[PDB]
Design a protein around this ligand. Structure first.
Ligand SMILES: *[C@@H]1O[C@H](CO)[C@@H](O)[C@H](O)[C@H]1NC(C)=O
Ligand SMILES: *[C@@H]1O[C@H](CO)[C@@H](O)[C@H](O)[C@H]1NC(C)=O
Ligand SMILES: *[C@@H]1O[C@H](CO)[C@@H](O)[C@H](O)[C@H]1NC(C)=O
Ligand SMILES: *[C@@H]1O[C@H](CO)[C@@H](O)[C@H](O)[C@H]1NC(C)=O
Ligand SMILES: *[C@@H]1O[C@H](CO)[C@@H](O)[C@H](O)[C@H]1NC(C)=O
Ligand SMILES: *[C@@H]1O[C@H](CO)[C@@H](O)[C@H](O)[C@H]1NC(C)=O
Ligand SMILES: *[C@@H]1O[C@H](CO)[C@@H](O)[C@H](O)[C@H]1NC(C)=O
Lengths: 120, 1038
């Protein structure tokens, strides 16, 4: 059963339903909200409009009451997020977790459903 | 897991270093038994006495130019009878040279002035330098301290008294320099230069166009206003400020540098020039710039224009018609107050012969030629036009644009702001006057004074511990203040800033208005302590104070535009001064000038000439009655013997050779550290871990051991360890890491204050501070020896650290990176432990991120402040409750904190820290909990008004981060003739615990390949592996 997004950073992204645990084995939204908020300075500096959605799609994955399958973001939104924020992250000491490598995401290929909002 | 009992034991080590090795308890007991005399004053008596000192210096300063003026004016009456036309070319005198009292760049002198010729002078020019030598020599011999004295004629000759063979590869066009322009034209000139770079202007003649614009900018003063516009195809103004799109900015060095670089960025364009829009824009700027300057009128507006043959054939006349119409309309809104000057850019073809007629129509504002009727019953200020080629002297042509201005025949002295000397090699200040014979202007006279000499009375004012001084002009710009860099070290003119910014305190704008208006007076105001700067808080003499009184006593300096003020902190409460005492020296006093003595056994202590035989005593420039005389003139063995005799004179018979009040009393009061230190050396086991110990006093006494030679300009009262201890009175102050002056590299300093008595623990009661220095690795060696928990692993997953109240770490599991691979603030808690840094920011009342403005480098700095009243123990509150538990508590009795972290599993945590500069990630807003290492954002100052661009920026001022200091020089002939004072062989140490902390050693861990770990860590001298990286560069050659 899906629950509503409680972490304020991930409110207003397109959906407000999630289900814990997430990909990072966070057992509650409070635990996941503390880790995803470490990227909040990068969101306010506007290095990529896809950053807030890409992070929230991983830390608070979308939960649909009728799908019952993990709906990850596409590889295109991961690349567009890193193309605009990674060079700034390397300067200010931020780092992508290895679990967020864009190769772990489906391509825009096969019947793997992913979530890119510019290709809808 | 336990940290409390571990912290109490760590506090005993801090007391064992402050009390036993340094001698804080002994000196506090001695200073408590001394006798003091109490004084109470509001500053009115002090502002009167200090005003007399600089008034006498300015009176003699004005008597020289007045004397030089009346001699050259009377010398012209002799020119009307006899030919006063001599030639003494400054490039034809090569018998010798000197450097006596300034002029230290190939300067002969003694009754022989020299002349430099401009290309405009004729063979019948007026040259009074023949007889002027008789008075110029008497002016210098009777008034030492003034550098140059010159007379520059209107014809173009430049004669200076100290003849120096300088700049012979060209002509010195002094008539185009700002000192000459501000004298012959003391009116506030609102100039706007329009630079046409359209109509396919050839780059060969745009060269002249952009070069001329640099001559205008480098020829006006801060009371003039300037704007530079482009082709006007699109009216592009200067983009380096928001107000440059609307107003004209005062020609400050900031606006000059911004406009000058904007001039060089101009490249040709093929679009036809839209002249009408450019002149219209210039008017809109001149119109929206307040009523003139609201400043004694004297506001002459001028529009310079640089172009050539635009035409446009079909609409040529239309283009000519649109400009002279909008000129007559906009200058009709004004009362024809705007004058227009035009300049032609020519090669042998483009401009031809008919295109000059359009530029003279613009200078004459010949609108009626095209029909447009002059609606204003007023006349028009007819301008002028000049032609320029690749052979044109831009200084004698476009540089003489001020001649076309009205000469209201003002005969008054004008004083320049501090600027860089073009003849010498330093900063100078110039007073000047014009030379008038009837209705004829002959030129100007001017004398240059060293900036350090004219300000020596306000730079080193130390009459009372409860007072300081600052000097400003009638416009508000600050010439001297405790927050400014000392002038003797400056190689560049500072950013002149209004006093409202350095005296950043609420309710001060009321006192500021009274200072700039009333010529004399005083006023007290009540200020809270939580919103103030350190110059006031460090002089409080009551503990637990929520608000304090301040007394501002000011008085304008007679016959000049400067105003001096005295700030007295808490005047209703007395200030103690050390009474004259008579202590006989138990040991012989040793002045720090070991180079001039050579009598004690010498040795090298890092990059210093030092000795272990006895500690030395130093007097800083400021303890002497003439600090500039002590800095400029050489200190000789004769003077060292005189000062040693007077300071150790117990008979009260030797007269004062040139020292200030309370200087010798503090030398005798601190003379007890000699036997105290030397006794500890014979029994201490920490002789290999202590790089030096010292004690410093407010009036300029500095006793260090090992007794080392220092630079004259060294002021320990402005170092970090001094100011950090004053801010934390009665507490052990950890300060570091910072770069050592003596050559020890990065060091950590324990500092402690000495008070007049133990019953009053306020910062203002500080009569001396003491400090002891250790190497970077020492406090981690202590942390490993004192606390066994820090050894469960090699500082890997279980890590211990010591953090000062600013967030910097002095003890560390890791401290090797210091090179090109890590951020600049890598020694901060936010970079080395980003998780616990994020978590402690959530602990209530523990941390507070601060904002301060630093107008000296136009930046806004972010820092941290953990309040050292932390009672109890702090653990994880938000982050890392499971994977990385930590314990943080204050080391009792000091400003430092001890921390232990137990990393059981990985965790994600970031604190933004730039690895290329110190720029903050987000310069739009500051969040208290957003973890980021110390950083800076560019300060947005409105240069059109002299205030902050955004009023939502009323942060306090960063008091001092004055980095420039002359690190002591060492050279061969001494490096090979002597050896190091302590030579504890680092090659014989085989573990980290044995090598850490040893002052001449370092534990190498990284190979010379940059960042590869070593399979064989070993101990070696610090020269061989800086920061543990074999072959790394010295931190002094960053
Ligand atoms: C949840 O998101 C939907 C859009 O998917 C939005 O219409 C709705 O207002 C959101 N919920 C709340 C409480 O605002
Ligand atoms: C660190 O935590 C582990 C449990 O994760 C514990 O076994 C160990 O004793 C702790 N170390 C210290 C120094 O407290
Ligand atoms: C021009 O002079 C008139 C008085 O004759 C005055 O009212 C007006 O303000 C002046 N123009 C400007 C721009 O101040
Ligand atoms: C400072 O203290 C005063 C009371 O003394 C208080 O009103 C104020 O909020 C405090 N903070 C600032 C920033 O003034
Ligand atoms: C200022 O001076 C007055 C008069 O001596 C005194 O009563 C007061 O306590 C002082 N301090 C403040 C903050 O007013
Ligand atoms: C830290 O400062 C606050 C006020 O800013 C003070 O009340 C508090 O007592 C201090 N911390 C501790 C642990 O006492
Ligand atoms: C702005 O600058 C002017 C001087 O140009 C000054 O008189 C005024 O006080 C400043 N504004 C404020 C709020 O201090």
């Amino acid at each position: 059963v899906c629950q509503e997004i409680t972490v304020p950073m991930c409110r207003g992204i397109g959906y407000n339903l999630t289900h814990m645990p997430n990909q990072f084995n966070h057992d509650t939204q409070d635990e996941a909200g503390l880790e995803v908020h470490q990227f909040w300075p990068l969101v306010e500096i506007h290095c990529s409009p896809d950053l807030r959605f890409f992070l929230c799609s991983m830390y608070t994955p979308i939960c649909l009451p009728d799908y019952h399958k993990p709906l990850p973001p596409c590889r295109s939104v991961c690349e567009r997020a890193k193309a605009g924020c990674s060079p700034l992250m390397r300067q200010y000491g931020f780092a992508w977790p290895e679990r967020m490598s864009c190769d772990r995401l489906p391509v825009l290929d096969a019947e793997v459903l992913c979530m890119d909002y510019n290709r809808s | 897991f336990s940290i409390l009992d571990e912290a109490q034991v760590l506090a005993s080590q801090m007391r064992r270093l402050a009390a036993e090795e340094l001698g804080v308890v002994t000196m506090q007991r001695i200073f408590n038994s001394l006798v003091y005399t109490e004084k109470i004053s509001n500053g009115e008596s002090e502002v009167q006495q200090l005003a007399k000192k600089i008034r006498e210096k300015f009176n003699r300063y004005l008597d020289v130019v007045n004397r030089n003026k009346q001699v050259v004016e009377a010398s012209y009456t002799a020119h009307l009878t006899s030919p006063l036309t001599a030639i003494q070319d400054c490039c034809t005198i090569p018998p010798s040279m000197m450097e006596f009292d300034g002029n230290f760049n190939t300067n002969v002198s003694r009754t022989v002035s020299c002349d430099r010729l401009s290309t405009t002078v004729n063979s019948r020019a007026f040259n009074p330098g023949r007889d002027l030598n008789s008075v110029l020599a008497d002016n210098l011999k009777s008034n030492p301290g003034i550098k140059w004295q010159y007379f520059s004629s209107e014809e173009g000759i430049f004669t200076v008294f100290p003849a120096h063979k300088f700049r012979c590869k060209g002509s010195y066009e002094h008539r185009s320099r700002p000192i000459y322009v501000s004298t012959v034209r003391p009116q506030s000139k609102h100039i706007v230069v329009i630079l046409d770079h359209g109509a396919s202007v050839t780059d060969t003649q745009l060269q002249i166009a952009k070069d001329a614009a640099q001559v205008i900018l480098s020829a006006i003063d801060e009371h003039d206003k300037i704007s530079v516009l482009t082709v006007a195809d699109a009216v592009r103004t200067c983009s380096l400020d928001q107000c440059y799109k609307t107003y004209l900015s005062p020609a400050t060095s900031e606006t000059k540098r911004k406009m000058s670089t904007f001039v060089s960025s101009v490249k040709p364009s093929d679009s036809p020039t839209q002249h009408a829009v450019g002149f219209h824009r210039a008017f809109q700027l001149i119109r929206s710039t307040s009523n003139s300057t609201r400043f004694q009128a004297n506001t002459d507006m001028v529009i310079i224009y640089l172009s050539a043959g635009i035409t446009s054939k079909d609409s040529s006349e239309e283009d000519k018609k649109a400009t002279l119409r909008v000129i007559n309309e906009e200058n009709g809104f004004l009362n024809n107050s705007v004058m227009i000057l035009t300049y032609a850019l020519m090669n042998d073809g483009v401009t031809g012969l008919k295109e000059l007629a359009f530029l003279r129509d613009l200078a004459e504002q010949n609108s009626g030629k095209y029909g447009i009727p002059d609606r204003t019953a007023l006349p028009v200020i007819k301008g002028s036009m000049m032609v320029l080629n690749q052979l044109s002297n831009l200084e004698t042509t476009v540089g003489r644009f001020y001649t076309n201005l009205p000469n209201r025949m003002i005969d008054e002295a004008v004083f320049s702001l501090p600027f860089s000397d073009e003849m010498g090699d330093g900063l100078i200040m110039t007073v000047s006057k014009p030379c008038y014979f009837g209705n004829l202007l002959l030129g100007i006279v001017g004398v240059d004074v060293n900036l350090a000499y004219i300000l020596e009375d306000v730079t080193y004012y130390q009459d009372s511990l409860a007072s300081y001084t600052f000097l400003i002009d009638d416009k508000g710009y600050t010439l001297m203040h405790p927050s400014l860099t000392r002038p003797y070290l400056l190689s560049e003119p500072p950013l002149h800033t209004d006093i409202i910014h350095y005296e950043n305190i609420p309710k001060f704008e009321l006192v500021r208005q009274n200072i700039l208006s009333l010529p004399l007076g005083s006023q007290i105001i009540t200020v809270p302590v939580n919103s103030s700067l350190s110059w006031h808080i460090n002089k409080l003499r009551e503990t637990g104070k929520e608000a304090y009184n301040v007394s501002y006593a000011w008085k304008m300096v007679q016959d000049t535009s400067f105003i001096l003020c005295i700030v007295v902190i808490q005047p209703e409460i007395p200030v103690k001064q050390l009474k004259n005492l008579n202590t006989v020296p138990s040991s012989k006093l040793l002045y720090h000038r070991l180079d001039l003595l050579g009598q004690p056994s010498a040795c090298l202590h890092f990059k210093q000439l030092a000795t272990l035989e006895s500690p030395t005593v130093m007097l800083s420039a400021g303890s002497f009655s003439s600090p500039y005389e002590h800095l400029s003139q050489p200190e000789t063995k004769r003077m060292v013997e005189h000062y040693t005799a007077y300071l150790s004179d117990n008979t009260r018979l030797i007269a004062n050779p040139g020292l200030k009040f309370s200087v010798r009393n503090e030398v005798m009061a601190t003379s007890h550290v000699t036997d105290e230190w030397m006794t500890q050396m014979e029994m201490s086991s920490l002789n290999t871990y202590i790089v030096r110990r010292y004690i410093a006093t407010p009036n300029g006494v500095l006793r260090i051991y090992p007794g080392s030679l220092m630079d004259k300009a060294f002021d320990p009262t402005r170092r970090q360890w001094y100011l950090h201890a004053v801010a934390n009175p009665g507490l052990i102050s950890l300060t570091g890491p910072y770069l050592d002056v003596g050559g020890a590299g990065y060091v950590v300093t324990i500092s402690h204050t000495i008070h007049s008595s133990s019953t009053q623990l306020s910062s203002g009661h500080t009569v001396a501070v003491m400090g002891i220095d250790f190497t970077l690795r020492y406090f981690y060696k202590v942390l490993m020896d004192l606390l066994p928990v820090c050894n469960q692993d090699g500082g890997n997953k279980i890590r211990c650290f010591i953090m000062e109240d600013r967030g910097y770490l002095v003890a560390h599991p890791t401290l090797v990176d210091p090179k090109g691979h890590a951020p600049l603030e890598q020694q901060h808690i936010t970079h080395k432990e980003p998780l616990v840094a994020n978590d402690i920011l959530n602990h209530p009342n523990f941390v507070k991120k601060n904002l301060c403005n630093s107008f000296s480098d136009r930046t806004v700095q972010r820092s941290y402040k953990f309040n050292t009243s932390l009672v109890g123990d702090l653990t994880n509150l938000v982050h890392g409750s499971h994977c990385s538990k930590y314990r943080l508590t204050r080391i009792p009795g000091t400003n430092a904190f001890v921390g232990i972290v137990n990393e059981t599993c990985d965790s994600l945590a970031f604190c933004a820290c730039s690895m290329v500069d110190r720029l903050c990630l987000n310069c739009h807003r500051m969040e208290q909990n957003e973890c980021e290492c110390p950083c800076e954002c560019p300060l947005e100052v409105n240069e059109c008004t002299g205030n902050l661009t955004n009023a939502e920026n009323r942060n306090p001022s960063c008091e001092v981060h004055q980095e420039p200091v002359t690190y002591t020089a060492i050279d061969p002939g001494l490096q090979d003739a002597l050896q190091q004072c302590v030579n504890s062989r680092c090659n014989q140490r085989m573990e980290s615990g044995d090598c850490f902390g040893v002052l001449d050693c370092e534990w190498c861990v990284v190979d010379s390949d940059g960042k590869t770990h070593l399979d064989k860590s070993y101990c070696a001298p610090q020269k061989e592996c800086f920061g543990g990286i074999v072959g790394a560069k010295s931190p002094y050659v960053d």
